[PDB]
Amino acid sequence: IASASCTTCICTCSCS
């Protein structure tokens, strides 16, 4: 639902 760097294609993932 909400995290940093870590889902496959919905909206977050990683980033620093």
Q: How far is CA 1 from the centre of its chain?
A: 9
For 11, half-sphere exposure in the C-beta direction (CA atoms, 13 angstrom radius) is: 3
User: Do 13 and 4 meet the contact criterion of CB atoms below 8 Å apart?
Assistant: yes
Question: In Å, what is the CA distance from 4 to each residue of 9, 15, 16?
Answer: 12, 7, 9
* DSSP collapsed to 3 states, the chain: CCCCCCCCCCCCCCCC
Count other Cβ atoms within 10 Å, centred on residue 1: 6
Integer Cα distance of 1 and 11 in angstroms: 8
Residues in the chain: 16
Tokens of 7: 């889902």
User: Do 7 and 13 meet the contact criterion of CB atoms below 8 Å apart?
Assistant: yes
Tokens of 12: 């977050």
